[PDB]
Amino acid sequence: QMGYDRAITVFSPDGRLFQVEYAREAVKRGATAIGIKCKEGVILIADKRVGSKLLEADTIEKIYKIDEHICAATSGLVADARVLIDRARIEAQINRLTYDEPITVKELAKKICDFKQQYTQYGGVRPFGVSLLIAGVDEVPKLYETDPSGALLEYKATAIGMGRNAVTEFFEKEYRDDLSFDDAMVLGLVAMGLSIESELVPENIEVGYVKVDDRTFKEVSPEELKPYVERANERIRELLKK
Amino acid sequence: QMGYDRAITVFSPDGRLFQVEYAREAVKRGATAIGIKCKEGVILIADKRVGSKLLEADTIEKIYKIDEHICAATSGLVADARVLIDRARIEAQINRLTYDEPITVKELAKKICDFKQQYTQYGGVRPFGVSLLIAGVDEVPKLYETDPSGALLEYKATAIGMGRNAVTEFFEKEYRDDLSFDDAMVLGLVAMGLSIESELVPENIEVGYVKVDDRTFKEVSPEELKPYVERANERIRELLKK
Amino acid sequence: QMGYDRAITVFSPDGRLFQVEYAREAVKRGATAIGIKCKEGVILIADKRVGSKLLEADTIEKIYKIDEHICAATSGLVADARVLIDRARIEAQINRLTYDEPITVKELAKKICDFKQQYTQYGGVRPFGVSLLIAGVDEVPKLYETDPSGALLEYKATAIGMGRNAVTEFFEKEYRDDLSFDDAMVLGLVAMGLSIESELVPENIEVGYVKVDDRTFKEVSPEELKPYVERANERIRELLKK
Amino acid sequence: QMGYDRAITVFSPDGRLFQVEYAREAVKRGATAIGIKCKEGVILIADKRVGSKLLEADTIEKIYKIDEHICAATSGLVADARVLIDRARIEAQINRLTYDEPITVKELAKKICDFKQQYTQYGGVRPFGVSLLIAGVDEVPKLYETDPSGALLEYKATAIGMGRNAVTEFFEKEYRDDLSFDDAMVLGLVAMGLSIESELVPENIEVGYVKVDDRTFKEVSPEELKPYVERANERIRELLKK
Amino acid sequence: QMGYDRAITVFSPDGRLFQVEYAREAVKRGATAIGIKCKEGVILIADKRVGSKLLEADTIEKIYKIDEHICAATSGLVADARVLIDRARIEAQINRLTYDEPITVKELAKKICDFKQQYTQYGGVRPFGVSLLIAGVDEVPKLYETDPSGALLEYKATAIGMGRNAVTEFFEKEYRDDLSFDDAMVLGLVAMGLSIESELVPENIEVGYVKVDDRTFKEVSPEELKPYVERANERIRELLKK
Amino acid sequence: TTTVGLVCKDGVVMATEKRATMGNFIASKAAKKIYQIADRMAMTTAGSVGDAQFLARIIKIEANLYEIRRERKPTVRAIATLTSNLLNSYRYFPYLVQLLIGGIDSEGKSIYSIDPIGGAIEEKDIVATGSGSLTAYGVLEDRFTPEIGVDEAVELAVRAIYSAMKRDSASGDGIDVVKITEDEFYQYSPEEVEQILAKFRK
Amino acid sequence: TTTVGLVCKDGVVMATEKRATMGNFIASKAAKKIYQIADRMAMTTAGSVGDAQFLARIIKIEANLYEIRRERKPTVRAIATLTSNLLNSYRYFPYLVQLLIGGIDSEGKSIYSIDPIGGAIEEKDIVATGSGSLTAYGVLEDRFTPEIGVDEAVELAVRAIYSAMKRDSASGDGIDVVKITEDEFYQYSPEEVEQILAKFRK
Amino acid sequence: TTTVGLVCKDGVVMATEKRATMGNFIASKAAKKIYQIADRMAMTTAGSVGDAQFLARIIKIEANLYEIRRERKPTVRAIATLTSNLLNSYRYFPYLVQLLIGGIDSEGKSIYSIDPIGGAIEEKDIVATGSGSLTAYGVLEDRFTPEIGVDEAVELAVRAIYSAMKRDSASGDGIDVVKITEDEFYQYSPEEVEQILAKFRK
Amino acid sequence: IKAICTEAGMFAIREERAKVTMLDFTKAIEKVLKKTTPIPDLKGVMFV
């Protein structure tokens, strides 16, 4: 016991609020999602391995449409994800209503950062125990990470969930923003294998993307994703021998 | 624990909300319920078992019709279940008001997952200690499980309740995806038979279902039940000698 | 078990809510109430036992009127009962306003039980620690137990209160579906006489009933309760030689 | 046991709301207020001895008017007495407002019980710590005991406060229903005499009564009190010689 | 313990608020911010060092345009800042609505202080654990630091965050009120170097200003930053050889 | 704009003229002005298409909710009263309309005329309603028999409204007859009807 | 003003007039009276310019949200019933606009016509909308074949509005056509449409 | 009370009447009705005087704040929708002014008209609004190539507003011409504008 | 730390090697980690 975390309004003696840092852990115990940005667009890839064979394969969903040109993926309680992602599409759409402009990646990211922070400040309702990936192309490709508290961090590439850490080490050395659309897709797939310590299957991942030269959202289809998976499998297998 | 399990507004150092984990134990307090999804309709089997022989077995059901092609089962509290499905009745109806269109099973799951989610976030209210299995057909058969927290998992074959454990084990081994409605009906009674650990009699089960050529909910009356239960009773015996 | 019984929004680790478990101990603490449902009616008898003559002959009251064909009777916190029953009265009337149809017991039980359920949910309000047994004839006779947790149960014969255990055992032997209206009502007195363990006079039992053949509630006079007492007393006497 | 008697929300294992019942010990410490009914009306006698002869002992007081045939005496906090008795006054004239008929003793008693219970059942607001005895003739003499709980018990003659223990034992022995207005008035004075163990004087007592024959509340001036006082006094001393 | 400290609505025996005292220290855990005021404007320097290289070099942003002629720095948690700057900006642009005039650097900084003071009195909410430096030219240059206590102190040169202690000491000897714009600007960068204990790269620090020959916000890009950073790096080297 | 209604002995029949016009836009001429409330429950509106259909969706939805919630099909009276109370709420703006709600239920067959500003009253076997009501009483009552069948009720429902049509000036060509004999929920619609009425007008 | 809709077996073709004329007032050189709701869905409105533009922006944004919500584009039906409901809610501000909401879905092609009191009705045929409607129906219905494409519908939709212009002082030019041929969501714009009427004149 | 707007090759130029007279009351002879919203955006008002300035002051405040929060200049389309939303949402606090929001932004050049009843329509490159609007369209379209310079556009802008004021008898004499050449924001203002039209002899 | 080392050395005896290794250590740490306030478990269900 502690009591610096019997409420979020009780600050720790250590200059920190532990209750929102446990809310970080909540994400971690949830399964991974990686966003990879290159200058040819941005990609968002997330786990669908979770669950046995009793289950249906289509496990709805990690890879949410928000706009037709903005996608978000999650880690954490997907109880706490589900209302926030509905709220995210309403809020996004409200920008769209009231200016008649597409919401910009940054501004969306900030609005969802702000929405978590109502729950963080207040004590009538706890902080969400979910993390968010927001990926889009307004006209400039952008990738952000939202913390459970509602903190805003710009990334070249990011992971959250169980695989957060393997992906971090992998990309620290090798990754470059000046890579191709093709490289970027396959390279984060390599990184995705390591995190689940297995070989990819296309049924085990749902992948969406935003293109810079379309400027629209499309969700990648299992067998259309399939070559990207084969070519990744050479690296994934190799790197786990060691 | 240690007061990190005695509120709903606390995460523990583990990042687990324990209050919610306890709300899932509530589900496990309640009795066995099974759903099966096949590609020809969706199947729902509820326990109808009475506590004593002086409790009438007519209203002690889990199976409640929610829309014209949507039914559902429950485990948890009765108390929580009855209000929780009444809300889903209003949602489904309202969707039909504003679109004149019967709600999608997927869309209904999303709305009532988010209903539960506010009861989870707020500290001045508990979450509902219930799970549902929402079974319907909208274009094609769909099957879902709602978590007490508000998570959404798509399934093809599932159970909730006390009998949960045994039934997964059964459907790991036996289950097939090319079984028809008739054949799978038989299998779901052997699974229920497994879980209650007796040869079933029509007067301790209730079956409802939705097929695709009917596009309606119909309810399996005890007359209409018997031949399926007899086929099943045969194999149920063999497992009470194993 | 402490810390899961200090609030109504705290589940114990078994998934039991001990706050709610303790609310059945309230019911068992208070006066017995026995209900007998028959093919010819539904007879509800509730304890009018007085412990002194200082107490007025009629203590207000053991059998409430809800509708002119619907009554319910109480075991538990008699304080609580007053607010609970005022509301009960009001809902049955309200439904005649807006549908102009007499309320059926199934739905009335649902609505009262939803009203309970709301105060189990909220942390600001403790739930009714009182049980009512709601009885009526609509299309056919009905007998329900509305529970302090907000569960409805339909029974064939029931009892609640301190006499609960004896009478669950009694009707396990004696409730048969060959019972007439007079032979059912004698049986409610005998059931009642085993619970308190003494012989009867008309004024320590309060009976009303709802007859099919009128479809109306009547409240049975002391004068025409005297004959049936005598027939019961014989039975009681033999039961008290064990 | 403890730890379930410091909150109003919590149930004990016993099922007893102990917070409500310590609001009844608040009633118990100070002081005799006695009701005694007959068929000639109802007589309400209450103590008015408190402190030295510097407290003007003719006012402050228990015998409040509620209506032109309804009156109440109090026991318990003076603070709760003031508001609760104002609510009961307001509800007597609400019946006049809305039905333009004399409020019945029963209806009034039911309302004000329901009022106390609402604050009992709502968590975060305490139970009133005061008790009334409600005395009146509608067309029929009634004497009721209205509880801090919000419960209703009808009597033929009773008392609350300090004297409750003494006057029950007394009325066990003494009471017949064949008393007159005057025989009841004097027998209540003898009850109240043993409870404070002393010879009563017009200075330290107050009596209001409601007659069937006129159905006025009348407030008995000390001059009028005095003939009765001589008659009860010979008894009071004799039984303090026994 | 120590306290008295698990609430903000409780004065501690030391005559403080513990909760708030702990919340000034949460600012120190997050990054530094360096403010320096001269008689040629007010320069604001904010640490944009975070992460390794997996993050984007630019991380939002950390030096916000608050009004046209006011900017603010942040120190402490990113989350708390996100929402704090939102209300400051709206309240500044409200001042221009209601008076059609500049807002004072002093009066703005007060109303920032008011927002966190509201969350210090009410026990249902926490104040932000974040400190902004408020730099602008109202019509003369002014530097203020806003504290999470709601505290306001006019400075002439300052640091807050990690470098708080270090950079106060550095400025006792070095700060001179007759420094040129270039000299003051460069002196602020030496103060950041001291804080991090490493040579500054102009790509991982963010600098903005308001002059008094312009009186509008501008920003120094990393290409523009080079000479300044070189002029800083000579002295930072001199510090890091002793 | 006129509606009629009659309980046969073995079914319930109502009919509705399709002609609604507002401005130089004809709202309905071959588009429904009859709505399905439940399986064997109907509602016909005499009044404007906008009002009628917004109200009708409300009553339809709560009709569905009744069948599910209480596990009991709705009676003529459940819908009827409910529509009234709801009509009382909204009175701030035009929501005054002449409604007939009928069909089959388990206590038998019924038709109920719901008055505009609330109220529901019942009618044994003949109702009207509409602006052509005066004409309708003559046609409908003269040829009513209490042992009237379905056959001759669909025939009679056309005859009341179409003889009324002439005398009315906001009524005109196009007519729907609805049949609920507890075996069909049929909507006869203009085309089929114009051919049955080809025999009783020419 | 007047807007026409017709359901072809190959798509939905509707048309508008951009100028909105009070009687002698050129209000706008051009104006959107055609809102692209989807690449399969449209709203083509006749009525007030300002209130119609407000409401179209609402529906368009929530049409898209409902597309995202289900992972599955609206039905034509589901947007239309949304407009009837949103109009009745907002009848306490005085917005009068008549709409044609139409398009293509999994069920097929349909148009739903809306009046500013409410109502949404099914039409598989010819529908025209505004104060030029009475004229429009005369042109459109005769030359309606169920074999009509979107290819022959564009000449017909032009021709309906065109006649209307020559008997109404409130019908503007800027004759626009929207064609939804189930491959594209195409706006011809004034220029192309103006040569089509150059072959109905000289 | 009229305002004009035209889109250049190299900028956008718009014009106002600057002295607004109604009856025999003149507010001021330097009453503002020309608004600067941003650096290369302008707004030009027709309609009431008082509602013009009060509305405008709030829109400058939105302009700034939206720039700061998105960190990109707001669009002409963004504020044109923003103003509409405001007008429809405030009908209990109604503003009676007809806006024209125009300028240069990232999108390019465009000029939106906003109605006093709200709602935002777009004109390709010419727009006229107000009492003077009918003549003012024909003055502009005589010389309008999309390749008109700013120097000739400001010349063109005057001849439409100058014609409008003399025809009416209760309009004042004042004009402001605004040029926004994508590098400059010039306000020519009554003196300089006056001599532009003094080359006509009268 | 000494008990983790001995436990590691015992773990090797069970794999029939004297070669001490990171994998032997990992099992050995876990014995100690089991005792104290354990961060392991759970993945959803609902936390996924």
Is G111 strand, coil or helix?
A: strand
| Residue from G121, G134, G144, G161 to probe the interface with F (highest F Cβ count within 10 Å) | G121
Q: Where are the beta strands (DSSP E) in chain E?
A: 33-38, 41-47, 63-67, 70-76, 130-137, 141-146, 152-155, 157-160, 205-211, 218-220
Taking Cα atoms as reference points, which of E48, E14, E45 lies closest to residue E30?
E48
Q: Please give the angle made by the CA atoms of A177, A180 and A181, to the nearest 5 degrees.
A: 105
F57 near F122, Cβ under 8 Å? no
Place of tokens 């470098």: E163
Determine the number of helices (DSSP H) and then strands (DSSP E) in chain E: 7, 10
**Shortest Cα–Cα distance, C55 to chain B (Å):** 35
B52 touches chain G (CB under 8 A): no
Note if G1 is an active site residue: yes
Two tokens at B39?
A: 């590609």
- The Cα–Cα gap between F81 and F119 comes to 7
Contact residues for D86 (Cβ-Cβ < 8 A; gap 6+): none
Exposure pattern of F112-129 as b/e (b: 16+ CB <10 Å)? Answer: bbbeeeeebeebebbbbb
| Residue from D121, D167, D177 to probe the interface with C (highest C Cβ count within 10 Å) | D121
Closest chain G residue to A97, measured at CA: G61
Rg (C-alpha) for chain G, rounded Å, is 16
A66 near I32, Cβ under 8 Å? no
Taking Cα atoms as reference points, which of E203, E209, E204 lies closest to residue E222?
E203
CB contact under 8 A, B151 and I42: no
C173 near C47, Cβ under 8 Å? no
| Type and span of the H or E element at H174 | none
H135 near H164, Cβ under 8 Å? yes
Two tokens at G82?
A: 């949304």
**Dihedral over alpha carbons F123, F124, F130, F135 (to 10 degrees):** -140
Two tokens at B57?
A: 């077995």
Q: Resolution reached, in Å?
A: 6.9
Two tokens at A157?
A: 């590439």
- The Cα–Cα gap between E186 and E184 comes to 6
CB contact under 8 A, G113 and F30: no
CB contact under 8 A, E93 and H61: yes
B63 near B45, Cβ under 8 Å? no
C29 near C76, Cβ under 8 Å? yes
Q: Give the side-chain half-sphere CA count within 13 A for H29.
A: 4
Exposure pattern of A50-80 as b/e (b: 16+ CB <10 Å)? Answer: bbeebbbeebbbbbbbbbebbbbbbbbbbbb
Cite the active site residues of H: 1
Taking Cα atoms as reference points, which of B19, B22, B16 lies closest to residue B7?
B19
Taking Cα atoms as reference points, which of C94, C138, C147 lies closest to residue C120?
C147
Q: What sign results for the dihedral spanned by CA atoms D167, D169, D171, D173?
A: negative
Q: Give the side-chain half-sphere CA count within 13 A for F86.
A: 16
Concatenating the DSSP letter of every residue in B164-226 gives: HHHHHHHHHHS--SS--HHHHHHHHHHHHHHHHTS---GGGEEEEEEETTT-SEEEE-HHHHH
Taking Cα atoms as reference points, which of A37, A36, A50, A16 lies closest to residue A201?
A50
Task: Note which residues in 8-67 of chain F have CB less than 8 A from chain B.
Answer: 57-58, 61-62, 64-65
The packing angle between helices D105-121 and C78-98, to 10°, is 100
Q: How many CB atoms lie within 10 A of CB B139?
A: 11
- The Cα–Cα gap between A94 and D114 comes to 48
Distances (CA, A) of F5 to E190, F42, F48, F77: 94, 11, 19, 16
Taking Cα atoms as reference points, which of C45, C71, B140 lies closest to residue A56?
B140
Taking Cα atoms as reference points, which of E214, E186, E215 lies closest to residue E67?
E215
Q: How many CB atoms lie within 10 A of CB B219?
A: 13
Two tokens at G133?
A: 């409607």
Spatial strand order of the sheet with C216-219 comes to C157-160, C33-38, C41-47, C205-211, C216-219
Task: Note which residues in 60-89 of chain A have CB less than 8 A from chain G.
Answer: 65-68, 86, 89
B21 touches chain A (CB under 8 A): no
Contact residues for F8 (Cβ-Cβ < 8 A; gap 6+): F109, F148, F149, F150, F153, F181
Place of tokens 């436990």: I7
Q: Give the side-chain half-sphere CA count within 13 A for I34.
A: 8
Q: Give the side-chain half-sphere CA count within 13 A for A189.
A: 26
The packing angle between helices B78-99 and F49-69, to 10°, is 160
**Burial, I16: exposed, middle or buried (Cβ in 10 Å; 0-12, 13-18, 19+)?**
exposed
G15 near G177, Cβ under 8 Å? yes
Task: Note which residues in 34-93 of chain A have CB less than 8 A from chain B.
Answer: 51-56, 58-60, 77-80, 82-83, 86
| Residue from A8, A56, A78 to probe the interface with B (highest B Cβ count within 10 Å) | A56
CB contact under 8 A, B98 and G70: no
Spatial strand order of the sheet with C141-146 comes to C63-67, C70-76, C130-137, C141-146, C152-154
- The Cα–Cα gap between H184 and D10 comes to 75
Q: How many CB atoms lie within 10 A of CB D90?
A: 11
* Cis geometry, peptide bond prior to residue C84 (ω within 30 degrees of 0): no
- The Cα–Cα gap between C159 and D237 comes to 51
Range of the domain at F74: 1-202
Q: Amino acid identity of C222?
A: P
- The Cα–Cα gap between A202 and H126 comes to 55
Place of tokens 């207020």: D33
CB contact under 8 A, F57 and B100: yes
Two tokens at H109?
A: 């050049």
Taking Cα atoms as reference points, which of C30, C49, C36, C38 lies closest to residue C196?
C49
Q: Give the side-chain half-sphere CA count within 13 A for C165.
A: 5
Q: Give the side-chain half-sphere CA count within 13 A for H1.
A: 16
Concatenating the DSSP letter of every residue in D134-197 gives: EEEESSSEEEEEE-TTS-EEEESEEEESTTHHHHHHHHHHH--S---HHHHHHHHHHHHHHHHT
**Shortest Cα–Cα distance, A90 to chain G (Å):** 7
Method: cryo-EM
| Per-residue 3-state assignment (H helix, E strand, C coil) for chain A | CCCCCCCCCCCCCCCCCHHHHHHHHHHHCCCCEEEEEECCEEEEEEECCCCCCCECCCCCCCCEECCCCEEEEEEECCCHHHHHHHHHHHHHHHHHHHHCCCCCHHHHHHHHHHHHHHHHHECCECCCCEEEEEEEECCCEEEEEECCCCCEEEECEEEECCCHHHHHHHHHHHCCCCCCHHHHHHHHHHHHHHHHCCCCCHHHEEEEEEECCCCCEEECCHHHHHHHHHHHHHHHHHHCCC
- The Cα–Cα gap between E102 and E139 comes to 9
- The Cα–Cα gap between G87 and H187 comes to 44
Query: How many residues are listed for chain I in this entry?
Result: 48
G180 near G103, Cβ under 8 Å? yes
Spatial strand order of the sheet with E141-146 comes to E63-67, E70-76, E130-137, E141-146, E152-155
Place of tokens 């759903």: B35
D near C: at least 3 beta-carbon pairs less than 8 Å apart: yes
Closest chain E residue to A145, measured at CA: E55
**Shortest Cα–Cα distance, I12 to chain B (Å):** 31
Two tokens at D153?
A: 């018990």
- The Cα–Cα gap between A33 and A145 comes to 11
Q: Where are the beta strands (DSSP E) in chain B?
A: 33-38, 41-47, 64-65, 70-75, 131-137, 141-146, 152-154, 157-160, 205-211, 217-220
Contact residues for F19 (Cβ-Cβ < 8 A; gap 6+): F1, F26, F28, F29, F170, F171, F172, F173, F174
- The Cα–Cα gap between C19 and C26 comes to 11
Residues in chain G with CB shorter than 8 Å from the CB of F28 are: 121
Taking Cα atoms as reference points, which of G81, E16, A10 lies closest to residue B96?
G81
Two tokens at B142?
A: 């769909």
Taking Cα atoms as reference points, which of D11, D8, B60 lies closest to residue C20?
D11
G41-47 and A70-76 as β-strands: parallel, antiparallel, unpaired?
Answer: unpaired
Of G66, G69, G81, the CB nearest to B100: G81
- The Cα–Cα gap between B188 and B192 comes to 6
Q: Amino acid identity of D47?
A: D
Taking Cα atoms as reference points, which of E46, E5, E81, E50 lies closest to residue E163?
E46
G near A: at least 3 beta-carbon pairs less than 8 Å apart: yes
E102 near E139, Cβ under 8 Å? yes
- The Cα–Cα gap between E161 and E151 comes to 15
Q: Phi, psi at residue C36, to the nearest 5°?
A: -135, 130
Residue F58 belongs to domain with CATH number: 3.60.20.10
- The Cα–Cα gap between F109 and F129 comes to 19
Task: Note which residues in 139-168 of chain F have CB less than 8 A from chain C.
Answer: none
Q: What sign results for the dihedral spanned by CA atoms B137, B139, B145, B147?
A: negative
**Dihedral over alpha carbons E58, E60, E65, E70 (to 10 degrees):** -90
Q: Phi, psi at residue A216, to the nearest 5°?
A: -150, 130
| Through-space distance between the first and last CA atoms of chain F, rounded to whole angstroms | 23
Of B101, B106, B110, the CB nearest to G78: B101
Spatial strand order of the sheet with H185-187 comes to H126-130, H2-7, H12-17, H175-180, H185-187
Can you name the residues that pair with B43 across neighbouring β-strands? B36, B209
F3 near F135, Cβ under 8 Å? no
The packing angle between helices G49-70 and H76-89, to 10°, is 110
- The Cα–Cα gap between B120 and B118 comes to 5
* Cis geometry, peptide bond prior to residue A61 (ω within 30 degrees of 0): yes
Residues in chain D with CB shorter than 8 Å from the CB of C58 are: 154
Of C106, C149, C168, the CB nearest to B79: C149
